[PDB]
Each structure stands twice: as structure tokens, then as C-alpha cells.
Amino acid sequence: NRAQKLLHYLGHVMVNGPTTPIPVKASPSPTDPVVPAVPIGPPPAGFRDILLREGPEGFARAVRNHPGLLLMDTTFRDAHQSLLATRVRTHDLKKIAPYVAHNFSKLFSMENWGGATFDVAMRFLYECPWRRLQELRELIPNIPFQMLLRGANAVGYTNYPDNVVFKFCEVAKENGMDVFRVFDSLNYLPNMLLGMEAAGSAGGVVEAAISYTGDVADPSRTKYSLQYYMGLAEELVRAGTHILCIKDMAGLLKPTACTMLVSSLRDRFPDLPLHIHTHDTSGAGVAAMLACAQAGADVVDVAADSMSGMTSQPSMGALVACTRGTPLDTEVPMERVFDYSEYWEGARGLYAAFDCTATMKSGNSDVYENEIPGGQYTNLHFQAHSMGLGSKFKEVKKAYVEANQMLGDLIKVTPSSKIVGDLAQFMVQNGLSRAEAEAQAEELSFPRSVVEFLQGYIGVPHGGFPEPFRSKVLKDLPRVEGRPGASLPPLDLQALEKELVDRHGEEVTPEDVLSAAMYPDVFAHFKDFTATFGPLDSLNTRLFLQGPKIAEEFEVELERGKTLHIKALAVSDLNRAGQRQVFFELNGQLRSILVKDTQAMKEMHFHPKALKDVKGQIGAPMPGKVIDIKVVAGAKVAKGQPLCVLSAMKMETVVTSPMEGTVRKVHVTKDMTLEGDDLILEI
Amino acid sequence: NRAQKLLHYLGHVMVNGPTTPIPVKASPSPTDPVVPAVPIGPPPAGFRDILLREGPEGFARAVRNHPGLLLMDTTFRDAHQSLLATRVRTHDLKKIAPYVAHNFSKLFSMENWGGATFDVAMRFLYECPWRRLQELRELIPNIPFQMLLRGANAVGYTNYPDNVVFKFCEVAKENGMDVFRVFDSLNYLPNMLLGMEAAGSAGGVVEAAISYTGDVADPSRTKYSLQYYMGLAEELVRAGTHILCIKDMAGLLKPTACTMLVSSLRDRFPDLPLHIHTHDTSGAGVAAMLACAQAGADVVDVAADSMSGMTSQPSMGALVACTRGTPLDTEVPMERVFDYSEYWEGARGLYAAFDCTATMKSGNSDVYENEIPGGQYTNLHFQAHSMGLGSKFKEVKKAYVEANQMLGDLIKVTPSSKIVGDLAQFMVQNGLSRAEAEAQAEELSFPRSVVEFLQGYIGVPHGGFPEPFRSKVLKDLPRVEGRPGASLPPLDLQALEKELVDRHGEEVTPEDVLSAAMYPDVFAHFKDFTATFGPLDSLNTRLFLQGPKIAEEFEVELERGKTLHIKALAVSDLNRAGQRQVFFELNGQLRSILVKDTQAMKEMHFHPKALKDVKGQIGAPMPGKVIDIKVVAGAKVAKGQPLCVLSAMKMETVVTSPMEGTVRKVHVTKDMTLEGDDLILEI
Numbered sequence A, B: 001n002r003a004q005k006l007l008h009y010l011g012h013v014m015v016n017g018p019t020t021p022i023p024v025k026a027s028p029s030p031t032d033p034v035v036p037a038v039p040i041g042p043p044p045a046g047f048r049d050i051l052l053r054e055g056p057e058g059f060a061r062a063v064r065n066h067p068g069l070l071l072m073d074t075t076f077r078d079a080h081q082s083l084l085a086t087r088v089r090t091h092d093l094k095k096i097a098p099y100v101a102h103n104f105s106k107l108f109s110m111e112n113w114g115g116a117t118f119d120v121a122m123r124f125l126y127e128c129p130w131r132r133l134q135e136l137r138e139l140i141p142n143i144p145f146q147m148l149l150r151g152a153n154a155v156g157y158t159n160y161p162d163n164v165v166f167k168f169c170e171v172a173k174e175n176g177m178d179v180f181r182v183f184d185s186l187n188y189l190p191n192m193l194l195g196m197e198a199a200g201s202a203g204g205v206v207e208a209a210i211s212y213t214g215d216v217a218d219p220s221r222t223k224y225s226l227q228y229y230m231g232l233a234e235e236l237v238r239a240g241t242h243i244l245c246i247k248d249m250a251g252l253l254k255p256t257a258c259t260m261l262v263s264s265l266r267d268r269f270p271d272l273p274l275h276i277h278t279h280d281t282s283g284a285g286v287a288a289m290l291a292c293a294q295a296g297a298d299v300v301d302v303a304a305d306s307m308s309g310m311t312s313q314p315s316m317g318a319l320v321a322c323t324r325g326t327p328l329d330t331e332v333p334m335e336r337v338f339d340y341s342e343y344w345e346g347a348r349g350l351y352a353a354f355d356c357t358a359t360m361k362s363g364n365s366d367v368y369e370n371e372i373p374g375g376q377y378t379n380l381h382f383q384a385h386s387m388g389l390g391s392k393f394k395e396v397k398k399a400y401v402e403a404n405q406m407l408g409d410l411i412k413v414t415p416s417s418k419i420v421g422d423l424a425q426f427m428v429q430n431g432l433s434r435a436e437a438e439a440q441a442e443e444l445s446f447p448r449s450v451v452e453f454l455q456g457y458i459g460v461p462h463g464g465f466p467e468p469f470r471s472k473v474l475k476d477l478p479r480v481e482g483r484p485g486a487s488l489p490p491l492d493l494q495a496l497e498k499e500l501v502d503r504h505g506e507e508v509t510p511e512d513v514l515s516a517a518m519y520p521d522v523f524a525h526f527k528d529f530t531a532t533f534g535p536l537d538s539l540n541t542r543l544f545l546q547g548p549k550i551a552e553e554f555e556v557e558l559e560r561g562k563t564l565h566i567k568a569l570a571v572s573d574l575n576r577a578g579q580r581q582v583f584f585e586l587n588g589q590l591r592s593i594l595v596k597d598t599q600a601m602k603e604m605h606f607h608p609k610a611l612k613d614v615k616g617q618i619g620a621p622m623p624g625k626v627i628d629i630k631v632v633a634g635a636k637v638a639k640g641q642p643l644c645v646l647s648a649m650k651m652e653t654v655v656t657s658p659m660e661g662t663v664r665k666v667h668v669t670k671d672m673t674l675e676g677d678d679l680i681l682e683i
């Protein structure tokens, strides 16, 4: 009963379309991604060998004592979150993972988990994220792995109790995660210290990421000054971080600001490794990374050349070529870069339904005025499409700016940017301005994320909440102040394990109860879907998003040894219950799949009958047209008296009543062409 | 391997259409024929009981001593030969045979075999005629059967040797035939005596049928006078016939001529039974039959009221009603007639593709000027449709009159009418008049039936052949005079049995070798078809001519006990070899049928290549357009010299020759937009 669920999925996708929401109506390309040649044998030695040999402090001293620029690949997580709405599957990553393991041994790390990959992998792709992590950990053994962990937000959207995040880092380090980049939205310091403690006690390398916004080189803006970042970095180094990081999530770091900030961090902490992360939204990413690498940055984040650009990271080939021959040489050969970007061009062609290039064709300097991050940009375009706002995204960006100013000049990264984007979609859908919605603040019903933020369930912003808005929206809802994670009670995780073993099965693991603690309803619907259709992980992307075509024999190997040569021969028409039939040739023998179509129902309405059991139910003895009614609705009549007269083709009849009674209502109007045995009078 | 051939037939009819030629593009009606209620038990006693009890002479004395008019039903043979091109199957006859056996016990006989039913049952319907005869002989035991046998023509179209017709009557009497109506086309007397001897020595009742033509009441026409019929009847009574018959095959008997001829035959032979057969083409059939029954006729031929009329027999209900209360009472109840005609209205609705009423909506008095018989009328319309003359049938009838006059005023019945109709289609297809084709008689190529008739292989006409035409068409072909059947050698029938057992199987019976003696190639193609698709006899007519529809469960019971509930679920698209696939649900399990489509082939042509193995094969290195040729076809050139120049999108190339040689031909013309690697010069 394994190929039957797969054929049910394939027929359901053929007849009804894909169960994924599709924002751009397009098909996957017929061209396959070209995987290059990989030398057979064990891969080279990398930085994970020195990590497992001498710990995180020796890893930090090795990355600090490396002559030249080090790179981190973000193609597996942040490139397709910025460009393809986080929709790239584990199949296309596993096809290129041995090439990366053989040829990119000199990388610092590789971000391939965390962010929005958790929620999208369970929600839209029907995959387990721990399964992707384990598969790529077997495939790439020589390069350290890196995950993007929020403060007390783990991989969710709100603050969690401490035991859940500690257990989350414990199990993620158990599965294979090496480097943990911990950041917070509002730069709220105890949430950062909590996330750093949870990441450090699990045994992993800690990368304390400071969220950057504004401009430190512009003295006109004084809220997030250079001294603000210097004090934040001083306290984060005082908590025992191993690598400091600057997360510029919108792409706002300019070369002068880069030189100023990295030189301040280098002459304040002379032996601490600096990592810079930026997006190339404004079009100045490679220039900013060259400014950082000359100012004293150690690791910078890149992506493959076909998977970089618009809202993504800077390009790997441009960073390799722009440092060739310099003292900052990365000594990576460019031909391996060419083959890797060749693969990702072929693989990006498969995801044309979620692609950024259907709307945005080049960069945009207006990110200097709306400050939207890139992953949020593509996921926000999808979310605005799925709520009817799919043709008003410029107004969503304008209300984005308005909602940033209205909520008190927040630092927008994931959670806070999700709050500002929810408020922007609310202000677009209800036509409200800034002052127009602050005047009606005590009347309107803001969404759960905005009201939950104004309560303070994610933390406290810099300079405090907007207190007139917080007084007008929150009437008497509880304002839990201080730290949200030090107030909420710990979830009994063995109770949740006991709650989940009696619903799905007995292969429920701690990874599953962490998936259900982070997302209860998404894990429930994911488990129901994978009960119905089974492991759709090992399908290719054209099969997953499009199904097969007629008379084209395709090969599916679900598990080890179990191979299936499947043809799709015909699709019938609809049955009595609105169901179609699909005919397959599975392993050479004919099989049949019955799938419910989803559009051919809910089309019926007509006039009711005249029920014969009651003599006071006067109906039409013959069809035609009501030409005159002789009764007043409310009086009573005798039997034999005329009530209504009807006419048909050369025929006219007068309706008589069979017995007495009070005329309740005249059910028929004037000149209503009714059928036979249809009710004209209730009596 | 029995349901597979049936499903192959059903899928072949679904995808490709019916293998029958269809003259009128229409579908069988969704209404089923309403079979009435039949009382359970043994049927009444009829005339076959007195036949089997006292022989043909006692049968003749019983039909001669019956007070009142006797009827013969022609609905099973002559009605659908006149109206539906002989296409009614054994299924629809078997559905009403027990009703006839229970309710029409007072019939004289029932014509249900012979005529064109043999050739059409093997050729277009894929049935054995002996199978129909045996099935209806089990179903109707109380009524004598009647067959229409030609002279020395048996059930064919030319004269046969004596042993074949004697064996034919032997086996037909063995199978269940009781009454044999023997007639000849030219009223050639020794062929009539041969057919009467073959029918009488087998042990059956002999009905000597005189073919009627012209008008005995009109003294202006003197060729077929009343004395001619009187002398013919005198010699046919002198040969020992049991029942005399007048076959008016075109419908030319008028009431005065009927009274004159039947009164002459009654006062010449006072104790011999007279049978009259007519068609209702002119619209005076019931009046003529009432005139015959009052003049002294004993049996008249009728048909069911929904299966009578236009070119068919007179109506049974009109004959029953017009003799009610008279001394000529038939004592048949009219309600049984109503139910029988109700069945045949429902069953005639199934044969809408072969129906007379698509062209002819009422009778026609022009049969007084063209003299076409009714069965020939419908079969001739089919034959003119299958030879491209389907829209020129009025010209076929005009050339019919011309070919009657041109061939010497023949008596037109089956063979002779087939000769005149072949000549009429020849004169329509070649635009010839009468004298225009007799002037070119020595030049043209008349068909095999006309030339074979002018040789005299069917017999000698009254007054001799047209001797200028017989001299001009026949140059030196052998004119076998006298009797054709007393000249030809007898066929070795055991040799033909030995020839047929080593081709099809070992269930080859004498009925099969008579079928192959009468029609060799039709029996061969019929045996190949029934080897491929099996016994298609037990299908209903909508299934046979139309196939099934999608998602409509139909029941087929091929043989005793073996029942099949078949659904048809889907039909795919075409394969590589142009074949479609049909999906069935046979007995509840899914089956697949692969049928060759017949239209999606024979579409390819383009320019040939330039073959690389020869250096003297100069072809186009790039596509484009020939703009100038610099060579003269015939001279020889050196290598490096320009030959042709070609242009494409912003590109122009000059063709050089690789070596020397003589330019044979310039293969390309001016401004021929050719492809790449396409030949421009042979050298």
C-alpha cells in the first residue's frame, strides 16, 4: 500500500491541480538541472575537522588566523527564501550536495536550515525539516553546518519558554548543526542572551548577530547610532559569544558605513572574528563586502551566481574574481563556481511558479525608504496574493512604510517585519492612512500579531512602545512586561509526546514533538497529509508540482531498492459523484485511481413542489403562465370558486379549490412561467 | 479468449466507427422495441401440422379448401429487403418469433430466408444464414417456412450447375424449409423446370412463380400478353407444380388486370391454389389484393403495418380490416396485429442508418415508367452510394429506363434487374445516352454482368437478344447457347470441402461449403472476420452498429450461461503507431484494448538530405535562402570557385566546391527557403 498513495497523489495533482498555492501561473521547465561530474572517493578536509578536533574556541581561533577572506554559502537557505518563497525542496539540494562536499571544502560554513524553511517545509512542501538536515548531513561531511535561530523565537513567530528553546538547540546539535546564528528583532538584550545561552550550552559555535538598520555614517539619524551598536556589541561580547555578526537584512550597509563599523569592531575587539551578512537589494552588496573584507571582516555570505542578485546575497563568482591576486585571496577555482551556478540555473528553472523574476526584474533602491527584507519580500508577496491583495503590492509597500512609522520605528526582521507586514496588509485592505487609523484606533480590530506585539509578547522595542497607540488599541488586555519568556510556564513535553503518540503512530520522535510545539496545527495537517499520500519527498519537482503527462514513462524510486516504472495512459470523464478516473501502468500492469474533482458541484436551485398529501396545497395541474389571480391573500374561499387562471399552448385552465380554508399566501407572482405540479396556493 | 474478441470489436467500433458501410449518417434510437406479452406453454396448431401429417398435395388441397382469404407474412424477409437494404439482424427477429408462434397460427407460411438475405447476412452483417434459419425454426414450430429460390441461380447472381442447386434444396429442406417459391428472371422455361425439379425432389412444396410485367389489361402492349402468361402457366402446371404464384415485383398489378388474370387462372385450373405477391410502390396494393381475393386468389402476401408501405408489401391490418365480416374473413384479431406492428415500429427505429424514409417519404407512381423492384430499389440506392453516385439517383433511375430499352425490354427481377442497374450506373458514370453508347458499343468496356448476360450465361430473353448490341459488344467471346446449366461441369463439392477444412478449422459443415460454392470470396472474408472478432450474432443492434457509451453498464450474454456485465470507462489518445487504447470493466475487473486508428497516417513529405559520405554531394552549411547561382548545369568547376550564395538573418555565405567534377544538375531553384544540410548541387 505504498505505490497506491503515490498514484493517488499523482492522479489528484493531474485532475485537480497541485495542492500547493501557486502565486504565478506557470509550469516547471522541461530542461533538467545539469549535475556536474564528481570525483569518486572521500571528500577533502574542511573546517568541520578542526571543529571536531579542537572545539568552538579553536574554531574561532582558526577562522581568526586565516590569511584571506572566507566565504559562507547561503544558497541552500537564504537564496531561495529571498527569491523563490522558500519553496526549494530537498531533492534539488541532494542532487548537488556531493559536488559541494568535493569541491567547496574551503568554506567557512553553509546555512541550510532555520529561517522560514521549517514552516514552509512542513506547510507547503510536506517534508520533514529534520529529514532534510539528516540527509544533507550524510551528504556533506566536511563542511560545518549553520542555522539561523531567533532569540526566544526559536523557529516560530512569538516568544517561547526557555525549556523549549533549550531542547530545540539540544536536538538540533544532536542532529548535526554546528554553528548557530542567534539574533533578535528589537535588539532586546535578554532574549539575545537567552538564545546565546541555549545555543552555547548545547555545545555549538555561537554567532551573535546584531541586526543593522538605518545608517551609522549619516549623523542626521540618531536613534540607532554607532555608539548604540558599539554598546550592543560590547555587551554581547561580555556574554561570551564566539563570532560576532552584522545582519543587514534589508541591504542598507554602504561601503563607508561598512568601513566605519568594521574598523570600530576591529579596534575594539582585536581578536574576535567578524561575520557580515547582507542582501543585494540596493545593488551595492559586492562593494560593501569588499569594503568589509578590507576593513577587517573575516567571513562574508555569498550565493551561487544564478541564485544571487535581486533580494538575495552577493554573487560567489564576483567575490572570487574581485579578490584574485590580492592578499584577500579566497583561492577557490572559478570553474567549480561555474559548474555550481550552472546547476542552480537549471534547478531555478524548475521553480518558475514561485520565482521573483515574474514581477521584479532587477534591483531596487527604494529599499532605502521602505526597508523590507528580502525573504520577507518574496514571502510577503505570496501572502498578499493569498489574501486577495495580489494586485496591490505597491500599496502594501507604501503601507509598510506607514506601519513602520505608526508602530514607532521598529527594527524589521522576521517577527517584527511580519508584524509590520500584517499591519500593512490590514491598512491596505481597509483603506486606512496612518493618522486616519490612529484616530480610529479605539474602534478598529487590528490582527493578532499587532495586538500581541503591543501587549509585549515578543519583547520591548528601543525607546518603548508608542504609548497613545498602546493605550488606544489595548483597552484592558494584559500587558506582560519585562521578559515574555521568563513569565510563561514551561510546556510539559512528555505530555505532548503522549498527546501525539495516540493520534498518528508509534514512530513519534522528539523532532516531531518539537515540530508540534513550534507549530501544532501545521504538524497536525502535515501528519494527516502524509498519512493520506505518504512520503512525497523523493519525487522530483516537475512531478511534485505538475504531475506526469500522458504516455511518458517516468521512474520513481521511493526508498532503497523499491523502484517503480510508471506510465499514465488516460483520464476519463466525471462519474455520478463528480469523480474522475485515472489509468496508470504501474510496473507494467494496469491500475486505476479514483479522484474527486473539486469544481463540478453546488449548481442546483428551482421552485419547490406542491405536496400531494395535504388537500390545502393547491398546485398547477398543467404548466404554462399565470395570467390572472382572483384571490386576495388573507381571506378564505369556498370550493368551486375560481382562484387563478393559467394559459399554455392553445389551452387555458381555471383553478378551483378542492375545499375551504384560509389563503395564507399567494406563492406565485404575475406571469411566472412555472411547471406542472408546482405550488400556486398555500391553504 | 472469447470476451477479448468481443471487446476488441467493441473498441474497434468505438474508435474507428462501424465496419459496415453506412449510407445514411444517423444513429440507432435510444428507444427499445417493445416485445408484447406471450402466454407460456405450447403454441397452437397451424398448417405445418397438416403439412407434416399429409404431404404437399394434402397441404395444397387444404389451402384450396379453406373458406376465406389466407395471408403470408413477409416481414422477416421482403419488408426489410425492400425498406432497410436487407440489414435486419437475427436478434430482432428472435425477439418477436415466439409472439408470432403463439398468435399468428392461422398463417399460410412466412417468408424468412432467401432473396438477398444470404449475401447480406454473410457480407455486411457477419452472420450465418443457416444459423438464422435454425434459430427461427426452433422458435416458430407451428407455421410453415417459405424461401425465395431463383431458377438455376439458387441464391446467387448467375446460372449454376444442377448438382449445386439440387444439393442446396436438399440441405435447405434438411434444415427446416417447407415451401420453395421458384422463379426465373427472363421467364426462361427450362431454368424454371430445373428449379422446380430441384425443389420438388427434395420433398418440399413447390410454388411456381410467374414474373409479371407490363399490363395484361392494356392491349397496346403486346409482348407480354395475357395469352403469354396463360401458356406459361399451362406449361408450369404441366410440370407438376403444387401452388401457382404471380410475382409482381415492381407493383404493376392494377385491380382490372388482377381480376382478368386471376379469373383466367381460376377458370382454366379450377382446383389449383393461387398465390399473389405484390409490392405497394404505386399505392394500389391493398386494392389489387382485394380484387385478387374476390377473383379467386387463395393466399396473399402482407407485412406488419409499420414495416409495410413504400416499396414493401401491403399492410396486414388493412387486409384484416377490409375483409372483416365478409365471406373472405381471415378471422385474425386486430389487437395481435397492433402489438406486432408496435414491436416492428420500435425495431425499425433501430435501423435508421439504412432506412428508406431518409430519401423516399411516400409512394411513387413513376414505377409505372421505370419498373424498378423494391428490394432492388433500396439495395440499388446503397450500391450507388458506395460507388460515388450517391447524389445522382434520379439519373440512375433515368438510365435505368434507358438501359431497359437498350437491352431489349427485359423482365426485371433480381438478376436481370441487377444487370440493368449495373448498366444504368455505368451509363450515369460515363455520361452516355442510349444511342450514344450504342454508337460507341464496339469501343467501350461494359461491366462483367452486362457482357456475361449478352453472352447468355443467365438464359435467353423473350424474343432473343438485341443482336446488333450482342454483335458489337461481344467481339469473339464464346456465346454458350441453349441452357447455361446443362453446359457447365459440376463442381466437385468434396474437393471444396477438402479445400475449406485446411484453412479455417474442422467445424466445416455442408452448409459452409454451399455458402462457399455460392460465394467463395464473401465466405472467405466472413470466416476471417469471425476468426478475428468471433460470434457477433448475439449482440443487440445499437451495440453492433454504434458500440457502447461511456459509464453505461451493458449486458452481453454470448452463449448459454456465459454472461458478461461490461462497462466502458475511457478512451485514451493515440500512441506512436497511431493506436488508441480503450478501458473496459469486464465482469468487474479492468481490461485494456489496443485498437489501430485508421486516419492518422500518410502525412509526411519534405526535401531530401545531402549525404555526407560523398564529397560530390554539395549541401547547405547553414539555412536561409538561395539568392544567386553562379554555375551552369552541365559544365565542370574547380575547387574554390563560387557556386551559390545564400542569405540568412544578417548573414551571407558563398558556397565553394571541395573538389572538381561535372555539375550534373542544379537541385535547388531560385529563392527556395531551404534548411541546413540540404542538398544544393549534385557533383
Ligand SMILES: *C(=O)CCCC[C@@H]1SC[C@@H]2NC(=O)N[C@@H]21
Pocket: A086, A115, A116, A119, A120, A375, A376, A379, A380, A413, A414, A415, A416, A417, A418, A419
Ligand atoms: C510562510 O509563508 C513562510 C514565510 C512567512 C514569513 C517569513 S518568516 C521569515 C521572513 N521574514 C518575514 O517577516 N517574513 C518571512
Ligand SMILES: *C(=O)CCCC[C@@H]1SC[C@@H]2NC(=O)N[C@@H]21
Pocket: B086, B115, B116, B119, B120, B375, B376, B379, B380, B413, B414, B415, B416, B417, B418, B419
Ligand atoms: C448486396 O448488396 C445485396 C443486394 C444486392 C442486390 C439485391 S439482390 C435482390 C434484389 N434484386 C436486385 O436486382 N437487387 C437486389
